[PDB]
Amino acid sequence: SYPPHMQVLLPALSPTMTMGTVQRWEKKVGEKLSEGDLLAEIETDKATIGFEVQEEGYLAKILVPEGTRDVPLGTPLCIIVEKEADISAFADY
Amino acid sequence: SYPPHMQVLLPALSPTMTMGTVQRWEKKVGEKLSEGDLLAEIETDKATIGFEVQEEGYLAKILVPEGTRDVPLGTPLCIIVEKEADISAFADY
Amino acid sequence: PKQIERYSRFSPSPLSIKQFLDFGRDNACEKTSYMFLRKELPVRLANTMREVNLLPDNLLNRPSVGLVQSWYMQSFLELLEYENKSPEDPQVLDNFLQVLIKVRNRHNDVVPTMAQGVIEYKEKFGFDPFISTNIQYFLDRFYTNRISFRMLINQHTLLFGTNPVHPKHIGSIDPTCNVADVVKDAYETAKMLCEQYYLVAPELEVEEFNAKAPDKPIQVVYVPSHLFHMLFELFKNSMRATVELYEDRKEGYPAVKTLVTLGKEDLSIKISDLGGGVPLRKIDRLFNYMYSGYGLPISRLYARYFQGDLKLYSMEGVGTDAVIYLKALSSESFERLPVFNKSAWRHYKTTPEADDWSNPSSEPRDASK
Amino acid sequence: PKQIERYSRFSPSPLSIKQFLDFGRDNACEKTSYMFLRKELPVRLANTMREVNLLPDNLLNRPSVGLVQSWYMQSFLELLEYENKSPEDPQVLDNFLQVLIKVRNRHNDVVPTMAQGVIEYKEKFGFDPFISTNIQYFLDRFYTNRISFRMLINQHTLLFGTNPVHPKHIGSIDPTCNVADVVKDAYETAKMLCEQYYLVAPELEVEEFNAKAPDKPIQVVYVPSHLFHMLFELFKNSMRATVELYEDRKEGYPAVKTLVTLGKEDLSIKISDLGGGVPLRKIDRLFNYMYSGYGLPISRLYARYFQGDLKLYSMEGVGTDAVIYLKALSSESFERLPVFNKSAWRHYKTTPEADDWSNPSSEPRDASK
Ligand SMILES: C[C@@H]1C[C@H]2O[C@@H]2/C=C\C=C\C(=O)Cc2c(Cl)c(O)cc(O)c2C(=O)O1
Ligand SMILES: C[C@@H]1C[C@H]2O[C@@H]2/C=C\C=C\C(=O)Cc2c(Cl)c(O)cc(O)c2C(=O)O1
Ligand SMILES: *C(=O)CCCC[C@@H](S)CCS
Ligand SMILES: *C(=O)CCCC[C@@H](S)CCS
Ligand SMILES: [K+]
Ligand SMILES: [K+]
């Protein structure tokens, strides 16, 4: 199928958040993700939040472009892969 | 014999250095050493220098006590070990 | 602490003086405030508690630190009772109010108890410079969040609780705060304390320059008691400096001078004294809780807290300037809150590093011989 | 670059004004200076070159950056020729001197060429805030090391090279530097440039307070040309500020005021103007090369360089204070040099991080509705 991958879903980043704007990606496709790196600024009605990487790997694809307003909770944002050899497997989507 | 270990020798930390004072250890026996951590302040006639760890592992024993003046180049300063299970092997010296 | 982990991963929601003012003046819906607070307060407590757990063991250990933790837990759990309790119920709103009061009271001794904590730690394990900056980082954040809890709780109790003291005030915010009036009040209060001990005190001199409207009294939207707190500390230090330098002299006491200015962005308040000043080497340490009383670092926290700052400059041998910067515009005056996250976590887990920049020998080579 | 790696792992040897002075006054042995310099200069160059290699690729790429690198390499290799050449030989000492001159000349266009480098990078890849702080960190270190090379080379050529200009001077150090005299010279020089363009210029007013010896001219051991450089920039900015604010007014031009003070530790020099000031939000960026000309950050480098500092405070709507702090004591005035090591390396390899402290929404919720 595809090599082992993880979808990063938009969490509720504060207790009342129901949607967020993907203001800026702070990682590029191909880059190593260490746990706790900055992944994106997400803007609500209430704050501009630094969304951190929760699991280590490699950024394989960005599902939600920079600038996309009003993204609902649970929307996949991007795809993470364990090895970098497995990044090219996803330019294909 | 003993488990695999490395001796840290006092380098010439500047071009004219021939000896140094071990002013302060910045690591305790048992601690993880990552490459580039601060290991000791070394004082010459010319400067007070942060001597960095050059190889990763675990601090097994300190051969030269804090405060020891005029330590010659090449004097072993401390002992590094690859696993932490191998630290106790050196309280014995 | 599964619940604390969770709420500590939430981000705080910083409010602006404008929002506080717009809310209490035009909206003023107890429901809205309840819905907001029942979630935000636990967020803030949890962000802080997560950081207190990151403290060095020998500090985390101290009874005083334990008590604070347990007070915060006690408060957190009490506020969580309300996560599923409908606002469409008079009683829930009524009970929530009393809850806020009870936690405000519980948190009364919090600044002193924590302080006692770090003092015990200092006098028992000793002063390390590196670890001092860790504790510094923590206390700034911890005392700022505590200023923030208190801001939220006060707005809610003042708005919905009632002895009607300051009447055109909106909760604890004065929409027409006359800066010079708070300056004179803060000064008189410090003057009385100075006179009591030293048997004398310098006079105050005040000038204003309002660049928008050159002759109008300078006014700003603000929390008068925060401004007061800040002014009180700087004045107390100025008077004590002046009085100590001139008690053995013949020329009599220089005034303590205040310039209040208002520009497009900044309300600046500069206090000048001729109290002899401080060497530059010692300036940074004056903000460092464990060389220290806490008065000056805390005053700076009140300032950085609505996007202002508090800065100190001295000329050793003559005197010292201290300048409070506030935002002129309420729309720009957002709470600045500490956020627990990986960046915060790394500050606690930082081990010492080689200096970046050179350091000389304590015994440099004698270049004459 | 095996040799560059090696010399870049050596630590620089920071000297004090006292040492420079003690050496040239009492010792003054060309041998000693040669032995020291033939090793120290390559140390310093190598520390820097290692850092230029750590630059973002898109900056490292620019021809201007390439040329600087190759100049430093060229200089490094030329100085390495001397590592095994005995000082007991008049010729070696003679040739070494010419080598120093040749590298000083080669490094003449270095500040502008690097600057051209970052400008090309900015205008071609764009302004990122985070990367700007990386470049900032680099330029401060790079321009400071370059100040240091020049200090060493000048001491050596002035001492052993000869038009005997300043005669009681020891190389480029004046043991009795009259601060007010440099203040007046720096002022006159900026005045002439201001008058030339603006057709007018504010007057200077100077006060001194010497706390050791209350009426004696304030004197310090220092490099007059560094003090001059710093004063010249601040005065130029003050005059330009004053003249621009009052050209459309009726009250005429406020003086630019200077207070020079001397305490146990600090020689402080405060320049005050009424040129209208700057909002606090913009202060930090004035020190940031790529919002920028370089005059003010560079002046601060000259100050931090013998353990002093250069600090700016303003009241938006009225004016600005700028204060140079120097050490009063030559024994305390050590070179502050950038040291390449793991701590330096990490600054270049830092990827951006979540903010530590909250940030509001660019469109905060309307709390009236
Ligand atoms: C060391 C001198 C003299 C001491 O008597 C002053 C009392 C308390 C000092 C508190 C400080 O931290 C520095 C300080 C501040 Cl904060 C100030 O607002 C005004 C001042 O003049 C001084 C100061 O110059 O202090
Ligand atoms: C923005 C205002 C007005 C501009 O006209 C001044 C010219 C150059 C400014 C350079 C600066 O970076 C800030 C500045 C400095 Cl450094 C100074 O020494 C004195 C000043 O008064 C100002 C200032 O307040 O500048
Ligand atoms: C964000 O949710 C807007 C909050 C509005 C109400 C605030 S001002 C509560 C009053 S303490
Ligand atoms: C350290 O080695 C002491 C150096 C003394 C000579 C210096 S001052 C060279 C003159 S540039
Ligand atoms: K958080
Ligand atoms: K080095």
mmCIF file of N, CA, C and O and ligand atoms in Angstrom, chain B residues 13, chain D residues 6-12 43 47 338-341, ligand 6:
data_model
loop_
_atom_site.group_PDB
_atom_site.id
_atom_site.type_symbol
_atom_site.label_atom_id
_atom_site.label_comp_id
_atom_site.label_asym_id
_atom_site.label_seq_id
_atom_site.Cartn_x
_atom_site.Cartn_y
_atom_site.Cartn_z
ATOM 1 N N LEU B 13 44.494 23.724 25.218
ATOM 2 C CA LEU B 13 43.213 24.351 24.863
ATOM 3 C C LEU B 13 43.393 25.697 24.144
ATOM 4 O O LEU B 13 42.438 26.295 23.641
ATOM 5 N N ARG D 6 41.284 22.834 13.499
ATOM 6 C CA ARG D 6 42.153 22.853 14.664
ATOM 7 C C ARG D 6 42.196 24.221 15.312
ATOM 8 O O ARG D 6 41.856 24.356 16.487
ATOM 9 N N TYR D 7 42.545 25.262 14.548
ATOM 10 C CA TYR D 7 42.807 26.523 15.257
ATOM 11 C C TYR D 7 41.444 27.075 15.798
ATOM 12 O O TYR D 7 41.387 27.803 16.811
ATOM 13 N N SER D 8 40.337 26.663 15.170
ATOM 14 C CA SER D 8 39.014 27.098 15.609
ATOM 15 C C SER D 8 38.591 26.413 16.915
ATOM 16 O O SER D 8 37.648 26.870 17.532
ATOM 17 N N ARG D 9 39.261 25.329 17.322
ATOM 18 C CA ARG D 9 38.992 24.644 18.604
ATOM 19 C C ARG D 9 39.844 25.244 19.718
ATOM 20 O O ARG D 9 39.622 24.967 20.896
ATOM 21 N N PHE D 10 40.822 26.066 19.351
ATOM 22 C CA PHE D 10 41.617 26.781 20.342
ATOM 23 C C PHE D 10 40.746 27.893 20.925
ATOM 24 O O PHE D 10 39.829 28.393 20.251
ATOM 25 N N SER D 11 40.990 28.271 22.173
ATOM 26 C CA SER D 11 40.257 29.384 22.764
ATOM 27 C C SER D 11 41.050 30.687 22.602
ATOM 28 O O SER D 11 42.259 30.695 22.716
ATOM 29 N N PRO D 12 40.394 31.781 22.250
ATOM 30 C CA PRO D 12 41.073 33.098 22.174
ATOM 31 C C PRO D 12 41.637 33.545 23.533
ATOM 32 O O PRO D 12 41.152 33.129 24.599
ATOM 33 N N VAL D 43 44.233 32.036 15.629
ATOM 34 C CA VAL D 43 43.159 31.561 16.472
ATOM 35 C C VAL D 43 41.895 32.332 16.198
ATOM 36 O O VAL D 43 40.821 31.745 15.983
ATOM 37 N N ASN D 47 38.362 30.957 14.545
ATOM 38 C CA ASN D 47 37.084 30.998 15.277
ATOM 39 C C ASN D 47 35.959 31.653 14.471
ATOM 40 O O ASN D 47 34.838 31.107 14.377
ATOM 41 N N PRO D 338 34.456 36.624 20.675
ATOM 42 C CA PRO D 338 33.560 35.519 20.498
ATOM 43 C C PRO D 338 34.389 34.230 20.346
ATOM 44 O O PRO D 338 35.450 34.222 19.685
ATOM 45 N N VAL D 339 33.900 33.161 20.967
ATOM 46 C CA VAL D 339 34.627 31.913 21.053
ATOM 47 C C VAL D 339 33.835 30.897 20.268
ATOM 48 O O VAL D 339 32.686 30.623 20.632
ATOM 49 N N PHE D 340 34.403 30.327 19.208
ATOM 50 C CA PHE D 340 33.664 29.253 18.509
ATOM 51 C C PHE D 340 33.704 27.949 19.366
ATOM 52 O O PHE D 340 34.800 27.542 19.816
ATOM 53 N N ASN D 341 32.549 27.294 19.551
ATOM 54 C CA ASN D 341 32.468 26.063 20.333
ATOM 55 C C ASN D 341 31.123 25.511 20.152
ATOM 56 O O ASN D 341 30.325 26.059 19.389
HETATM 57 K K K E 6 37.335 27.851 20.027
#
